[PDB]
Design an enzyme around this catalytic site. Structure first.
Site, mmCIF file in Angstrom:
data_model
loop_
_atom_site.group_PDB
_atom_site.id
_atom_site.type_symbol
_atom_site.label_atom_id
_atom_site.label_comp_id
_atom_site.label_asym_id
_atom_site.label_seq_id
_atom_site.Cartn_x
_atom_site.Cartn_y
_atom_site.Cartn_z
ATOM 1 N N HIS A 62 0.822 -1.209 0.000
ATOM 2 C CA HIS A 62 0.000 0.000 0.000
ATOM 3 C C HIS A 62 0.860 1.264 0.000
ATOM 4 O O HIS A 62 0.439 2.272 -0.549
ATOM 5 C CB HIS A 62 -0.920 0.024 1.229
ATOM 6 C CG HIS A 62 -1.770 -1.198 1.384
ATOM 7 N ND1 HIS A 62 -2.755 -1.567 0.484
ATOM 8 C CD2 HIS A 62 -1.732 -2.144 2.367
ATOM 9 C CE1 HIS A 62 -3.311 -2.698 0.904
ATOM 10 N NE2 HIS A 62 -2.697 -3.069 2.075
ATOM 11 N N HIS A 88 5.890 7.572 6.003
ATOM 12 C CA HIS A 88 5.500 6.931 4.768
ATOM 13 C C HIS A 88 4.856 7.980 3.876
ATOM 14 O O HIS A 88 4.674 9.113 4.295
ATOM 15 C CB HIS A 88 4.562 5.740 5.047
ATOM 16 C CG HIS A 88 3.270 6.128 5.689
ATOM 17 N ND1 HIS A 88 3.029 6.075 7.043
ATOM 18 C CD2 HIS A 88 2.173 6.669 5.094
ATOM 19 C CE1 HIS A 88 1.806 6.544 7.275
ATOM 20 N NE2 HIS A 88 1.254 6.901 6.068
#
Ligand SMILES: [Zn+2]
Length: 222
Positions: A62, A88
């Protein structure tokens, strides 16, 4: 439960993929958001205490995520100490400023002593290649592997010297979309180019931006 950004398991449907993910569709304080009308206030200053660390870089299917096994990378705001757990990226950006979407966003995820979650977000404009990120892009895995890293990283590089921010309350932008997250979005933008953004997208498999969610009762403080 499998969740994604296209097809049957896309964000419009995350609510229904599981009872665990229900808040993704019922929640009234969801992220991300479009920051448009704000209240001008006196926000406490962010003090950042990041340093060279050993990190583990992970493709989780993801996002590309840089994990901090040890503490010591902290941020202090209003005399509370929040520890950096991981950062992230989303390409394109999730949060918006007056309708404006950015080529990329970084989310720096923290916890304080009482387990209170805090996300600091940097937005990246179109511009030159990001030198400071090259270290991560070079070791970026292109399948669900992890690079344990006799490569360190200093996250203090990834934050601007001007630490003015927008402040609101909201959620995780991925399932289970837990609420109770403090969001601090920095007003000063960094830069990336198309080749770094496309490389992230290759690795992760898709664009990983959840659509903006209504503010409802929430005020954004600038
Ligand atoms: Zn995120």
């Amino acid at each position: 439960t499998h969740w994604g950004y296209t097809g049957h398991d896309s964000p419009e449907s995350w609510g229904n993929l599981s009872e665990e993910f229900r808040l993704c569709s019922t929640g009234k304080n969801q992220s991300p958001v479009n920051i448009t009308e704000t209240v001008s206030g006196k926000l406490p200053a962010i003090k950042v205490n990041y340093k060279p660390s050993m990190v583990d870089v992970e493709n989780n299917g993801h996002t590309i995520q840089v994990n901090y096994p040890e503490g010591g990378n902290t941020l202090t705001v209003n005399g509370r100490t929040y520890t950096l757990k991981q950062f992230h990226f989303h390409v394109p950006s999730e949060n918006q400023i007056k309708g404006r979407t950015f080529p990329m966003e970084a989310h720096f995820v923290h916890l304080d002593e009482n387990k209170q979650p805090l996300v600091l977000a940097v937005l990246y404009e179109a511009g030159k290649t990001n030198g400071r990120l090259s270290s991560i892009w070079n070791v970026m895995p292109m399948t669900a592997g992890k690079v344990k890293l006799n490569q360190p990283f200093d996250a203090s590089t990834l934050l601007p010297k001007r630490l003015k921010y927008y402040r609101f309350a909201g959620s995780l932008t991925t399932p289970p979309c837990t609420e109770g997250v403090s969001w601090l979005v920095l007003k000063t933008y960094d830069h990336i180019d198309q080749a770094q953004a496309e490389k992230f997208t290759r690795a992760v498999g898709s664009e990983n931006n959840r659509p903006v969610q209504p503010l409802n009762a929430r005020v954004v403080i600038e």
